Amino acid sequence: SFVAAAVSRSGPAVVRIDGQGSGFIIDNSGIILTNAHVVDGASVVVTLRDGRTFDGQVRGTDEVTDLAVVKIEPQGSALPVAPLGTSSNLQVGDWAIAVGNPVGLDNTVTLGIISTLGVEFIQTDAAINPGNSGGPLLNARGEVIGINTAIGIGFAIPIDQAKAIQNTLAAGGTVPHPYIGVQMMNITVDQAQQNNRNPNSPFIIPEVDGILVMRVLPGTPAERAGIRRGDVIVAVDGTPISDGARLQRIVEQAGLNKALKLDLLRGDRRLSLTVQTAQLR
């Protein structure tokens, strides 16, 4: 089986982290990737497939990406290393191999394909469970292209994503995740004026197509800037938006603590406020 050769290649680097979960060694220095939710805030014991029980510390965590970097001290035999691939060239329908180490001696291995592609997130019909969460998702050649994340379709954090924030979580563990605190929705004129003809809709949307503020989250830059539920942000900057996905981007392209003006109308009144981007936590 072609998967056997893949498991033989990256499998010995897949470790147990103990609540529980899996991880995998990134290089001989003792740098291990896993899920942040595998690490309940503390800083764990790492068991290799050969039985060696090192002692690991959690050098970083990104909660919103759900991935941690654990460290162990290389001693005796060389720490096995899983070869990193790249997730930027993944094809929908390519083989996917989910490897975990639930006990610390064997490798549990499931097989599937790339079920869908977000770059943003990976889906697979390979059985993903607590038994392999934090462990690697490999391609047919046995190089890691994702990090299994348990919650028949499973999810994996792309490997190019973890590469980006590796050094950071290796060092001081705080990744820039700018935000404002607004649960928005895509609104359509033909949804809006259609809303406006239902006698029991909460608020009349001011026609138009846009992002309808559905909720203002407590203690957020959007609450502090006086944004209300039912508001409609029409233009940020001068850029007309109707996408709730697109707005998430421009926030991030702006720094942390970056003032962004918001042209929005409150039913009838035209209203412009400036939120200042905070760090999601």
Place this chain on the structure above:
Amino acid sequence: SFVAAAVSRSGPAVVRIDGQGSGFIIDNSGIILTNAHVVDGASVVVTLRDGRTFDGQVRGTDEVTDLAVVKIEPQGSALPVAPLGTSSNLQVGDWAIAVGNPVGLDNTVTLGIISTLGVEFIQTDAAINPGNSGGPLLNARGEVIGINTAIGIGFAIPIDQAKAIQNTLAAGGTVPHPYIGVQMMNITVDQAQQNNRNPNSPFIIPEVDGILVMRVLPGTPAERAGIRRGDVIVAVDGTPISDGARLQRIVEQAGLNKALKLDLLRGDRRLSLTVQTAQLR
């Protein structure tokens, strides 16, 4: 026991109606009171406490008051009759005796007191159940003061209430229940401007104290008059209201198909519409 004398007095008039339920004979003509929900729209068999199984027809029904008038034909022995009392002089704490006839031969009897008084509705800590629903609620002297209604506190339709619509349900069964179709709520400035400072409230209430239209019911005079959720009816007629109970009254004091103008404001706009009262059904 004083209740034994009461059960001996009205008990023989308490009949079984067969979904199931109880009823009681109002006079020797064969006029029987029960709950409308005892009668599933059809027009039933009546069993007296002595075993006599007459055959009854449903001559009327008021769904919103939940009470019916059944008719049976007097033959042979005289139909036993329960003496009607009056519910207009009931005291909170007076004895209450709930009599049912669940099988048609015995009388099941529970004892309690008048737990609270609405006139509008009677509460009692006398055990009220399917076994006595439609049956009479008696005072210490054994005259009916209510009609048990199953849904430790039970409810009874006052007897003065049934007296009112007796002849009607005896004849053509349609009782005037004017309405407009608006689920309203009492609003307070200190609830309103307090609402208006919660960033995630549906709509800003225009300050003031009043009746906040919480919902417009489908296919109602209020939907047809263009009333919306979130609206605030300030004055009907010229009469300022902040009570959701009080408005229910003036509607009823107006006839059926009676145009009532409604001064209300929609956020900022002042708005006057006239609903025309329909019959609740």
Place this chain on the structure above:
Amino acid sequence: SFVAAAVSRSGPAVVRIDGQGSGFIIDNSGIILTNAHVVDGASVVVTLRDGRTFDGQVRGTDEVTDLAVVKIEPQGSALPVAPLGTSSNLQVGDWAIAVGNPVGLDNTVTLGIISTLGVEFIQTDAAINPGNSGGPLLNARGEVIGINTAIGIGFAIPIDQAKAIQNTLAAGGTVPHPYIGVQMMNITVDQAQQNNRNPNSPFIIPEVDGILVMRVLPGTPAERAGIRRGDVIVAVDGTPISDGARLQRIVEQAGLNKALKLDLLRGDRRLSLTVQTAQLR
């Protein structure tokens, strides 16, 4: 309170039996009544209201009447005795006082009325629970008229009933409960031929009014006599029956191991079988 005088009269005789439950002392010899289901087949420790912990044995049990006779040995102070009343003159609406001894020092006491009368069984709106099951149900004068049985309406085994089988359960504990093992139902022509016009009824009933054998219980005289589901026993003896209650009687009036012929028709065929009455167990 009149109930206080009743509790003062019979209350000291009400004991704890330990699964758990209450009982009450019938005479100074140490004869105690309780529910059979209070006694899980074994033969328990009796605590009086004064704290005296005697040691009791179970001298009898009737499972189908659900009542036991326990025995304790009188020593020291005189065993308090609850005065027996008679349940044959009970009126629906007479006061009912349910006394239990859940701990063995106090008496828990609830108050209600005789909710309905079977002789056969007593109903009451007096709160009946595990706390007073096996304990006595008293009248306004404080003499026991029932035995509380937990399963807002409660049940009590009449006291005249327990009187009957007292000596038996005092001695050898087997009460004559003749039976045949047939779950029957009252059938009506207007239910029968009405059944016979539903295309999806199990079996066509042969018209008539009667007792439709709904089920034959496994290992019973009715199974052994070849009785089937769907059968219709028309006449026992020569006595036409359509009552499922009435048949239960004539069985009992016949002895144990008493051959009773059964005229019944199986769809079209006329069929006569003789069951021999066994003891319900």
Place this chain on the structure above:
Amino acid sequence: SFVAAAVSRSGPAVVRIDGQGSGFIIDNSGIILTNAHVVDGASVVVTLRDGRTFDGQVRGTDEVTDLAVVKIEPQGSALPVAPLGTSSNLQVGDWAIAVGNPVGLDNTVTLGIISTLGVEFIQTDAAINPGNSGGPLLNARGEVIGINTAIGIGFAIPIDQAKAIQNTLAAGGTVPHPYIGVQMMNITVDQAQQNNRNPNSPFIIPEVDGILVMRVLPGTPAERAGIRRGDVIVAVDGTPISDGARLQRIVEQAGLNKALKLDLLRGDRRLSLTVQTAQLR
């Protein structure tokens, strides 16, 4: 991956239909196949993988086969077309690729095999869900061999099946599904006389092997022809049957409104009735 080449071949023709569900374009005219249950009776908006949002109408529906034919108007770029294969030569164990378009831009793809074969229905261990229901099931070469149907085993309507009723649902949407309305069961002498010795069986089966009418469905040709529950159709035509599957066939081979005589016995009586086949709806 061989599946990537298959997804590249049929994937661009897989569209979103919006309750929700997938579909796939059959030719450049704008003919799209999906599940009837994707179309809640109405006549929807079609999004192609490239983002083009056409507007589709439902030209046909077969409820009992659960498949619809939607139409869109070709404009601009050529409508991508999924190549039809044939399901008549499918092997149990051949690769199966379930493609859906849950959002309208990507293709979600799962991989499995032909789990079992009915011709009549297709089973697969390829993950089938709301995300791909109505979408195509492909073979290793990327030609559609089924239509995914969501309800770890999934189902797919064979493609040769849809081919048959394509033109019909393309035009006037009524497919001939003759029936009579009888839930039957295969009966065996050794089940029958074995039934006939259980005292609590509903009805005695008249020995024999056959189709035991278990239920007569309301308002059906079988109710109208006087067929009852418990009946045993022995011969249709002169053809002895004991199969409940086989009878479903001969009905269909007969037209619509086709009189079929039914030799059946009702316990003891021999009975012959003629049902007239109606259209399942």
Place this chain on the structure above:
Amino acid sequence: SFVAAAVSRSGPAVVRIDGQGSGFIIDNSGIILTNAHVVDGASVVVTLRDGRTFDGQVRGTDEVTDLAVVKIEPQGSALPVAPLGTSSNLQVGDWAIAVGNPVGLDNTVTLGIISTLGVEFIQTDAAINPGNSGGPLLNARGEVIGINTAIGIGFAIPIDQAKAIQNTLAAGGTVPHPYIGVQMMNITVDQAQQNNRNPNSPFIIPEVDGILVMRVLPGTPAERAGIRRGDVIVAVDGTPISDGARLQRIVEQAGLNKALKLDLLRGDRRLSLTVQTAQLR
């Protein structure tokens, strides 16, 4: 009804406190009793039966007795006052009247008897609910003998109990409730050596009769004094105990911060520790 005269006597003093609940005015100064659990820690609005909406502050709270003292400012008409009775002479079987004010205009009233007596706690078959919690429980004469407490048997805090801590909760709201933090159990030799013969009992009890420490509560004087689960306190002071109720007393008779030595054995070892009593919170 005698209860009507009682409700007329204390009823006007029964107020609404607004989560919700009832209370009653103790004197014309504006001192109101209620349940501590009616007051969610904050310091509420009081509505009298006449409609007068005063504004009340919470001057005290005892969480473990579950009772608060609220204060309102007397103005205009005289504040109605409920006459206090004494619970030290209550008889099991005396009438009990539970009065609440769920809306602030009427009084809901239920009737029962004193179901059992702890002094320590009152039980009643009078329906006790959220509608009357904090409200008074009256005797037949209409003087308060308890304070309804919602959680068919209800509970009431005795009135002599509230009298004790009135002035305290009127002033600085901290009542002396000394404790040590040990969930104990009564152990018997015939339970102990009987335990010691079950192979799967947690720990062997060292024979004897006593208080078996079942649990040590976190952050308590008993944890701090090194007491463990499974321990057996044989003598406090020199006083042999086998009662888990009796020990609760001597703690309280000792002050707060009062060192109490504890002779206890840990399996085999004899062990004496001194806990220092803390305040239950």
Place this chain on the structure above:
Amino acid sequence: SFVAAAVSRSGPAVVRIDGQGSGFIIDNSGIILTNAHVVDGASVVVTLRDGRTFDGQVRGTDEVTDLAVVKIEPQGSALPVAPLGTSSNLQVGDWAIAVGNPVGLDNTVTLGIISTLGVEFIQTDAAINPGNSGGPLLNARGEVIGINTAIGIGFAIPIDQAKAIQNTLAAGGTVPHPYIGVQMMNITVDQAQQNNRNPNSPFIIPEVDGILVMRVLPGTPAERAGIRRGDVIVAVDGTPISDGARLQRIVEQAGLNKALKLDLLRGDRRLSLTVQTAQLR
């Protein structure tokens, strides 16, 4: 598909056994393997893929291995035979094909890989269900390497395992499964003295690393030898153990009815007992 060739090779030997379940024929003599839990103790009817309904008897059963050997009599056409492979050389990631016969005419087939390896047990992401339980799990070449066992990961009894006890279950069906009846746990000093510092742990573990008897099962050699919960077996024989898996072995290496001394300490006391191994049943 390579699986098609595998299903074509072993599939015709896969039979239905009728609660339900699958099995497969081991040689032309009529020897069939299945799960013991497919056979509810009785001794079933076997349907081959071709429709031939033989009649099978259950010649053996191992409950603890959950596998039976059924026998059918070869007649007419040659009984198809599934070729046995060996599970001793299985690789994690090798293809796994689960074949069942749920109806007796087709073969339902699912595909996966060897998810993990115990030798002791096989895991697979091939869908294993009631539809294929007892049926064979094949490799890519189509020789059986396991026996599916239903309870997305499934389990299979290795085929080398069944080979071992084949002749036995073919003949007299009792396999040697020696045992003592102790639910043990691995204990660690750093778990022990860590336990010993929790005030609410059941019993103090006597430091050390070992097997902590967690439970003594009723009516077992361990109960009979006086072993208690909380005990710590330090050395069997002279062999120090801290593994709960390892002890299970040495028992089995000893015969049936084989006395094994057990050095264990009960808190403080050193204790040596000899259990005699019984047969698990």
Place this chain on the structure above:
Amino acid sequence: XXXXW
């Protein structure tokens, strides 16, 4: 009807 037995 009741039956019972």
Place this chain on the structure above:
Amino acid sequence: XXXXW
């Protein structure tokens, strides 16, 4: 408030 209707 109640509403109803």
Place this chain on the structure above:
Amino acid sequence: XXXXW
């Protein structure tokens, strides 16, 4: 058997 219809 199946029935259906």
Place this chain on the structure above:
Amino acid sequence: XXXXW
């Protein structure tokens, strides 16, 4: 026993 505390 009760305990409590």
Place this chain on the structure above:
Amino acid sequence: XXXXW
């Protein structure tokens, strides 16, 4: 739309 934050 998604929102999130």
Place this chain on the structure above:
Amino acid sequence: XXXXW
């Protein structure tokens, strides 16, 4: 640990 038995 496992135990079993």
